[PDB]
Design a protein around this ligand. Structure first.
Ligand SMILES: Cc1cc2nc3c(=O)[nH]c(=O)nc-3n(C[C@H](O)[C@H](O)[C@H](O)COP(=O)(O)OP(=O)(O)OC[C@H]3O[C@@H](n4cnc5c(N)ncnc54)[C@H](O)[C@@H]3O)c2cc1C
Ligand code: SF4
Ligand code: SF4
Ligand code: SF4
Ligand code: SF4
Ligand code: SF4
Ligand code: SF4
Ligand code: SF4
Ligand code: SF4
Ligand code: SF4
Ligand code: SF4
Ligand code: FES
Lengths: 78, 662, 137, 84
């Protein structure tokens, strides 16, 4: 019925609803359904640009925007 | 006065041509306007609710709706105005759709807006001067009249009588039955046409609620939906029924249909039932199955020899000095079922109808093929009495013809009856071949296509070409039919022993006179016109008159019977209620302004006006039942002593003044 | 600065039906004529026409049923006689009598209604503003 | 009759304005969308906004949109009546 309940309630977002040509969820637009509180956050005043969190992540969902230093590449700064 | 203006968008049909916001603001600034407002569909239930809420909240005196045509939605908004505590007639429309939007769509928008403002202003000006009317209710006489005793007239009469209404059945001819009584077998079921009618003829003749008046005409009709004072001419039949004989004092009886009179009559004349092929005496019946078996005397051809009365003897049924008696009958509704006749095909000279012996038309063929006809049911050639072996059928004879001689329409049943006649010849004469020269076989009804398939299977030849001309062989009297086989692509010359023309049909003789007596108009085609061509094919614009049968347009016996029962139902609607409401548009004379000149009296087609005594002064008197609201008298009267109820001079002049207001 | 002011008085049973049919069929014409809608043209009094012309109608049109096709058997014969006499009065008071005409439009002639609209507009545009509006002062 | 004084359905359209299901319209021979709660066209005679229970997901947005009118009963069942 193209409600989009499956898209809201899939833990790893592998289902999307596109009404005309855009990802559009009317049931959320009208607030007719709750969503999952994954509650993610990374206190940037405590993270140290370590590489462990990207390494241990089973799916691909961590972005480490750090200049790439001499390790594996030309210096990000030096 | 307090007027509300409600402007419909009609779902962008109006908002796509003008500025509804501007029209609404102008209505607000207009004088007398309490509330102005808009909605997408004012004819819908939220629209009526909007009107009613506005009435209740703003204490509205009148309502103006700027919307579609009054002819489309007066009843809707009058009922919406009633529901809300107003009179229905405190309402007025401003047609801003069918006379503003749909005609000023393109490239002209502020001009259409100005036109809409003008129309709204004129409507408000009229509605600020409208006042309360109550429709007139008139009693309905509990009788009905059916003119025409064909299948459609008989069905309508039986339907009304079995609904319980007393009914008059007027037939100009001495017997009921119509054309279906002349038919031999009926398409597509091939039932004996006369036989199916006979029980229904017996039912009509025996029904206590039907006053069957054969051989009678309608001299004059006056009145309206309530009471129609119809004068009938009882033509001098010359022979007395048993009831009339007993009334006149002859105990022995009247006519029992023995036939001795016609056995001794020496005059011999053609029989119109047999299309002239057969003799009949001066005293006669059409056929042996006529419903009133009463033996009319033909006074135009009787020589008063008196042999018939001697043959009748003690029954004394024959009165050779009888004269046309006149009777006046009051009826509530009337049903018109006048039928049809065959178009005169001798005008099409290329098909030698009157000039070649062996060219006949389809009703003469139907009488020749019937077993009760002039022949013993044996089709023989008129020229020499020999049996034909090739028969041609000229379809479309005088039809779908724009030359001014024939009819520009299709006669509906001529393709089907030609198929029936081809089947009849191929089954009655062994080895005979039927050729149909056709131009669009039209087998559209139920089982008609299957009938067409079956005829082709039995072996009729279908040549798609309109016949060009017909030549008669000088010696054998055979007919050379010349046309082109359009599918084959070659000219043809088919020599047949008998040629049958499937002639067009036209309204019966005198039908225009009768429909003018009853006030019915005519169609483009020349048939009687119906109230609404789609949703009301039975009723006419004149109230209390209904149409049934071929008189409204050519049709087969099934469609004719459906139409006849529909007309009977429509005629029963007001009789069962017993009341009917007239539209309060009547003329009302203001007596202390009338001067008694009497000049308006002759301006009424309906004779609703007369001079009468009121308070010593001679003033004019309106029969409010007879008035129809035209307004001729009130547009004449110089002193303004006639008031038209919903279109009064102050109202119309207020509309004019509002138009010129700037 | 000047737009013609043409007023039409059309019967309900043929001219209103014809105008409605033209609208339904989407026949375009200029928006210069405004209609009044009486039941028959027999209702049209002479004083209606004269009142229009003295208020300042640049033109007046009266449209009704064909002869023999009046809903009320003979109400447009009366209107025709009245309008012939109105044509005579306007000619003898010195107003241009072609500012007034009476057309017979049937219920099915939406095209003819459109053509009547166009021709009335053209004729009044040629004639120009009515003289009453300045003769009053 | 059921006791709601404020009324039933007035055909405002808020329900179908908020319904998230979209299905073909059989009146338009399938060419056009219509929500789970719908009317065929704007000129339907009973302007009462049927709910299509084969396609409704019972999200309950329609009842919130209807509000105090309380015209929507998502648990309604087929009632049977015998008429002589
Ligand atoms: C050759 C032919 C073959 C046909 N074959 C078939 C067929 O096989 N099957 C089929 O279904 N249809 C057939 N039809 C069509 C069929 O005849 C009509 O559908 C049917 O007769 C319509 O009947 P009606 O009552 O309307 O008219 P009619 O039968 O014509 O009856 C009208 C009656 O009114 C009377 N009348 C007329 N004017 C007045 C008046 N002013 N006052 C009083 N009375 C008046 C007439 O005398 C007549 O009795 C055929 C038609 C023709 C011409
Ligand atoms: S949950 Fe997903 S699959 Fe199921 S009806 Fe809704 S959109 Fe379709
Ligand atoms: S694991 Fe990720 S979030 Fe934690 S300190 Fe390392 S980079 Fe920062
Ligand atoms: S009242 Fe007339 S204009 Fe308004 S919505 Fe209905 S049909 Fe359209
Ligand atoms: S003889 Fe007399 S009773 Fe017999 S059919 Fe003739 S009129 Fe009738
Ligand atoms: S009076 Fe003579 S002509 Fe006339 S019906 Fe009798 S027998 Fe025939
Ligand atoms: S019904 Fe057939 S034969 Fe008769 S006019 Fe129409 S097309 Fe011609
Ligand atoms: S109403 Fe007018 S026309 Fe009729 S009698 Fe009175 S004054 Fe004469
Ligand atoms: S309006 Fe006058 S002329 Fe017309 S029917 Fe009524 S009374 Fe007769
Ligand atoms: S169900 Fe409720 S919200 Fe939907 S149209 Fe009816 S009243 Fe309005
Ligand atoms: S309950 Fe059904 S009709 Fe109402 S919003 Fe949800 S899906 Fe649409
Ligand atoms: S009904 Fe139109 S002129 Fe009489």
């Amino acid at each position: 019925s193209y409600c989009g309940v499956c898209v809201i309630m899939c833990p790893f977002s592998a289902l999307a609803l596109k009404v005309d040509g855009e990802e559009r969820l009317p049931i959320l637009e009208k607030e007719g359904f709750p969503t999952y509180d994954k509650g993610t956050a990374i206190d940037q005043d405590k993270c140290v640009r370590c590489n462990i969190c990207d390494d241990v992540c089973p799916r691909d969902a961590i972005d480490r925007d750090v200049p790439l230093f001499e390790g594996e590449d030309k210096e990000g700064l030096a | 006065p307090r007027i509300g203006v409600f402007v419909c968008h009609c779902g962008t049909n109006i908002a796509g041509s003008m500025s509804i916001d501007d029209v609404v603001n102008y209505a607000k600034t207009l004088p007398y306007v309490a509330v102005a407002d808009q909605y997408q569909y004012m004819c819908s239930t939220p629209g009526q609710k909007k009107i009613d809420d506005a009435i209740k909240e703003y204490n509205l005196t009148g309502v103006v709706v700027a919307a579609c045509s009054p002819r489309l939605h007066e009843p809707t908004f009058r009922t919406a105005t009633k529901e809300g505590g107003l009179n229905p007639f405190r309402f007025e429309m401003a047609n801003i759709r069918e006379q503003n939007s749909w005609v000023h769509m393109h490239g002209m928008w502020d001009e259409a807006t100005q036109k809409a403002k003008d129309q709204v202003r004129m409507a408000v000006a009229k509605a600020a001067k409208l006042e309360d009317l109550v429709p007139k209710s008139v009693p309905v006489e509990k009788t009905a009249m059916v003119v025409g005793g064909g299948v459609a007239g008989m069905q309508a009469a039986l339907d009304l009588a079995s609904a319980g209404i007393k009914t008059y059945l007027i037939e100009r001819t001495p017997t009921i039955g119509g054309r279906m009584s002349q038919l031999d077998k009926t398409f597509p079921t091939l039932d004996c046409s006369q036989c199916i009618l006979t029980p229904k003829m017996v039912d009509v003749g025996r029904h206590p609620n039907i006053e069957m008046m054969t051989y009678t005409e309608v001299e004059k009709v006056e009145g309206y939906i309530g009471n129609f004072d119809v004068t009938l001419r009882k033509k001098a039949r010359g022979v007395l029924t048993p009831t009339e004989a007993t009334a006149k004092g002859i105990v022995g009886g009247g006519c029992n249909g023995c036939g001795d009179c016609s056995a001794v009559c020496p005059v011999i004349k053609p029989n119109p039932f047999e299309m002239g092929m057969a003799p009949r005496k001066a005293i006669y019946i059409y056929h042996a199955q006529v419903m009133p078996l009463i033996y009319t005397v033909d006074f135009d051809s009787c020589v008063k020899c008196g042999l018939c009365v001697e043959a009748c003897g003690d029954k004394k049924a024959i009165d050779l000095e009888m004269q046309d008696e006149f009777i006046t009958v009051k009826v509530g509704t009337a049903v018109l079922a006048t039928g049809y006749e065959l178009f005169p095909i001798e005008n099409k000279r290329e098909w030698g109808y009157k000039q070649f012996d062996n060219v006949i038309n389809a009703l003469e063929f139907e009488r020749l093929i019937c077993a009760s006809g002039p022949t013993g049911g044996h089709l023989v050639r008129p020229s020499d009495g020999k049996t034909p072996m090739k028969v041609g059928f000229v379809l479309c004879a005088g039809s779908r013809d724009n030359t001014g001689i024939g009819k520009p329409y299709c006669s509906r049943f001529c393709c089907m009856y030609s198929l029936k006649h081809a089947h009849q010849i191929m089954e009655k004469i062994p080895g005979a071949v039927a050729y149909l020269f056709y131009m669009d076989i039209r087998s559209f009804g139920k089982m008609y296509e299957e009938f067409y398939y079956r005829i082709q299977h039995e072996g009729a030849k279908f040549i798609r070409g309109r016949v060009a001309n017909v030549l008669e062989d000088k010696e054998t009297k055979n007919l050379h039919v010349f046309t082109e086989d359009t599918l084959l692509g070659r000219p043809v010359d088919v020599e047949v022993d008998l040629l049958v023309l499937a002639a067009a049909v036209q309204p019966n003789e005198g039908a225009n006179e009768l429909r003018k007596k009853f006030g019915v108009s005519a169609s483009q085609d020349g048939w009687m016109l119906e109230a609404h061509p789609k949703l009301n094919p039975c009723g006419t614009t004149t109230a209390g008159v209904f149409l049934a049968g071929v008189c409204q347009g050519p049709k087969d016996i099934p469609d004719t019977v459906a139409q006849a029962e529909g007309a009977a139902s429509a005629a029963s609607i007001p009789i069962h209620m017993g009341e009917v409401e007239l539209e309060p548009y009547f003329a009302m004379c203001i007596d202390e302004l009338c001067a008694g000149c009497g000049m308006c009296v002759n301006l009424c087609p309906y004779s609703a006006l007369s001079l009468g005594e009121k308070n010593g002064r001679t003033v004019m008197v309106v029969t409010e039942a007879k008035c129809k609201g035209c307004g001729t008298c009130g547009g004449f009267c110089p002193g303004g002593a006639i008031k038209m109820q919903h279109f009064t001079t102050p109202q119309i002049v207020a509309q004019i003044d509002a138009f010129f207001a700037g | 600065d000047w737009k013609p002011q043409i007023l039409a008085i059309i019967c309900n049973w043929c001219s209103y039906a014809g105008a409605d049919l033209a609208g339904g069929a989407r026949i375009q014409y200029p928006p210069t004529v405004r209609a009044i809608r009486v039941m028959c043209t027999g209702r049209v009094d002479m004083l209606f026409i004269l009142k229009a012309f003295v208020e300042g109608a640049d033109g007046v049109l009266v449209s009704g049923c064909h002869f023999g096709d009046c809903h009320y058997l003979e109400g447009n014969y009366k209107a025709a006689k009245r309008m012939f006499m109105i044509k005579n009065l306007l000619r003898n008071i010195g107003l241009d009598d072609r500012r007034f005409r009476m057309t017979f439009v049937s219920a099915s002639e939406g095209a003819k209604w459109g053509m009547v609209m166009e021709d009335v507009t053209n004729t009044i545009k040629e004639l120009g503003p009515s003289p009453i509006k300045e003769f009053k002062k």
